[PDB]
Paper text:
To gain insights into the reaction catalyzed by cADO, we determined structures of wild type ADO from Synechococcus elongates PCC7942 (Se) with different treatment (WT0, no treatment; WT1, co-crystallized with iron; WT-HP, soaked in H2O2), and solved the structures of two SeADO mutants (Y122F and F86YF87Y).
Following the analysis of the extracts together with the observed electron densities, we built a long-chain fatty acid (Lox) into the structure of WT-HP, and a long-chain fatty alcohol (Lred) into three other structures. On the basis of these observations, we propose that the Lred ligand may represent the real substrate, namely fatty aldehyde, because of the similarity in their chemical structures. In the WT1 structure, a Lred ligand, which was proposed to mimic the substrate aldehyde, was modeled in the substrate channel according to the electron density. The ligand approaches the di-iron cluster from the opposite side of His147, with its head-group binding directly to the Fe2 atom. The residue Glu144, which is located in helix H5, changes its rotamer and is not coordinated with either iron atoms. In addition, E115 alters its mode of Fe2 coordination, from bidentate to monodentate, while other four iron-coordinating residues stay unchanged, resulting in a distorted tetrahedral coordination of both Fe1 and Fe2. The structure of WT1 is likely to represent the state where the enzyme is bound with substrate. The structural comparison between WT1 and Y122F implied that the swing of Glu144 might be induced by ligand binding, thus enabled us to visualize the conformational change coupled with substrate binding in cADO active site for the first time.
Residue numbers in the entry: 11 to 231
The structure:
């Protein structure tokens, strides 16, 4: 029942959170575009994709006659967003890449795919389209970081350590509203640990290293 006051209420926060992610992602990729001149056009492309996602999700909100609680969503993203900004200012492209392209993208992939089977038919269509783009964004980050892994390794570990716990906290924060929308926490935690562990394996981390990196997240709750 997409019309109930309890579905509308949870949707107000989830829709707003998703919209903030897409909008925030737009700025992250534009900022990366400055920091990685060799990848400037490509990163600009990924930015414009995020813009379209934002519009797509604003339209999912209107379809269910829900005003997004943007204030709640700004606060949801705040810590992780300020960490990205500070990294950009420091010239730390690797940290900015791991945040947005790996931690974050992955997060949207796991949650979005879980949302698809329980989503109203308008939003299901919008979401199927956005998730397709997300695979690309994650692949871009994996490809760059695997190509530059030795130079990048130590900063990735450090960035993972500061930022993965922020995503776990975001995960806990959304859990109850997500359930109302028909999305189980257990699937979301699992699909995220899997997606991010595989991304870490794919760029070059060992079993012990992935366990260490993953554990910084799981331990924060
Ligand atoms: C209406 C969308 C339903 C899915 C909501 C997922 C719950 C919280 C995850 C939000 C993650 C936002 C990340 C967007 C980043 C874009 O590249
Ligand atoms: Fe996106
Ligand atoms: Fe994205």
């Amino acid at each position: 029942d997409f019309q109930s006051e309890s579905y509308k209420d949870a949707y107000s926060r989830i829709n707003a959170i998703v919209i903030e992610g897409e909008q925030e992602a737009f700025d992250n990729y534009n900022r990366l575009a400055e920091m990685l001149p060799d990848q400037r056009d490509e990163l600009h492309k990924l930015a414009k994709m995020e813009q379209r996602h934002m519009k797509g999700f604003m339209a999912c909100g209107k379809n269910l006659s829900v005003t997004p609680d943007m204030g709640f969503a700004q606060k949801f993203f705040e810590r992780l967003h300020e960490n990205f900004k500070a990294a950009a200012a420091e010239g730390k492209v690797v940290t900015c890449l791991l945040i947005q392209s790996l931690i974050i993208e992955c997060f949207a992939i796991a949650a979005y795919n879980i949302y698809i089977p329980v989503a109203d038919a308008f939003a299901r269509k919008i979401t199927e389209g956005v998730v397709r783009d997300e695979y690309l964004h994650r692949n871009f980050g994996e490809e760059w970081l695997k190509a530059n892994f030795d130079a990048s390794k130590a900063e990735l570990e450090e960035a993972n350590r500061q930022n993965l716990p922020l995503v776990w906290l975001m995960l806990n924060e959304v859990a109850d509203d997500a359930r109302e929308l028909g999305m189980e926490r257990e699937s979301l935690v699992e699909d995220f640990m899997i997606a991010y562990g595989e991304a870490l394996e794919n760029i070059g981390f060992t079993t012990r290293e992935i366990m260490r990196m993953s554990a910084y997240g799981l331990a924060a709750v």
